[PDB]
């Protein structure tokens, strides 16, 4: 074992697991999911005495993993995962998922043209997850046409600015609980324009962080066995956090 030395001892045998998923979505204007995937990694931070043999178990039956490499120390086959981890922080596994992804937010855009002069836009977001969980760091980014003289917005939650240099309205919300709805309206004031070329309407995109794996993955157990030393599994202090963040998360209209 060239990844972990042999004299390692800790008063407090403790490990930390991070499940870090980025969830990607391309959604049609009429709500069809055009494309969706999740990339994830499990990072482990372990302060464990000796040369312990852990078994990592999750609900891979109950979700479907489409492939994934592991860390050198993983013993290859419920065909569950086995290893002696390096001390400190390392990447346990990396994975991909396409089936049965929880799409934490739903974006519902509504767009109305007022002659040649104004666009009326309403955008609704819906959080799709347990009410006890908060999403945070939410941005909705609404692209505006190149011939935009100015923008008025109203929204009850958050703050929104027109950012002319980037041709987008950006709406930010610090936190938002599962199973809710929020909306923004904007009046976009148009300059006159070359009648011929139509507006090539980029999607509305989102940023967010959520405290669960959007793939549905959960950690069931991480079992520690070091059989020379006089600690056992139930002496180990175990922590998990899940951090699901948006990758490319777009809704067309």
């Amino acid at each position: 074992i060239g990844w972990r030395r042999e004299g390692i001892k800790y008063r407090r045998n403790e490990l930390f697991l991070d499940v870090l998923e980025s969830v990607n979505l391309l959604m049609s204007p009429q709500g069809q999911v055009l494309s969706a995937h999740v990339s994830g990694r499990v990072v482990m931070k372990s302060y464990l005495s000796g040369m312990p043999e852990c078994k990592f178990g999750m609900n891979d039956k109950s979700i479907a993993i489409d492939d994934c490499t592991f860390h050198q120390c993983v013993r290859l086959s419920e065909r569950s995962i086995s290893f002696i981890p390096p001390d400190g922080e390392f990447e346990l596994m990396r994975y991909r998922t396409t089936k049965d992804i929880i799409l934490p937010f739903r974006v519902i855009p509504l767009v109305r043209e007022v002659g040649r002069t104004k666009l009326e836009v309403k955008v609704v977001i819906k959080s799709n997850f347990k009410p006890s969980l908060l999403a945070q760091k939410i941005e909705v980014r609404i692209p505006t046409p190149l011939n935009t003289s100015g923008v008025q917005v109203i929204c009850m939650k958050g703050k929104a600015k027109y950012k002319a240099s980037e041709n987008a309205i950006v709406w930010k919300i610090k936190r938002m609980a599962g199973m809710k709805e929020s909306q923004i309206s904007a009046e976009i004031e148009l300059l006159p324009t070359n009648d011929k070329k139509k507006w090539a309407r980029p999607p509305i995109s989102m940023n967010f962080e959520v405290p669960f794996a959007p793939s549905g993955l959960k950690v069931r157990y991480l079992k520690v066995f070091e059989p020379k030393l006089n600690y056992s599994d139930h002496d180990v202090i175990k922590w998990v956090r899940y951090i699901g963040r948006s990758g490319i998360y777009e809704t067309r209209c």
Binding site: L17, K137, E209, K218, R220, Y221, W239, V240, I243
Partner: peptide, 10 residues
């Protein structure tokens, strides 16, 4: 969103 939960569940 980035708080450690103690123990693993299912």
């Amino acid at each position: 969103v980035e708080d450690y939960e103690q123990g693993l569940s299912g």
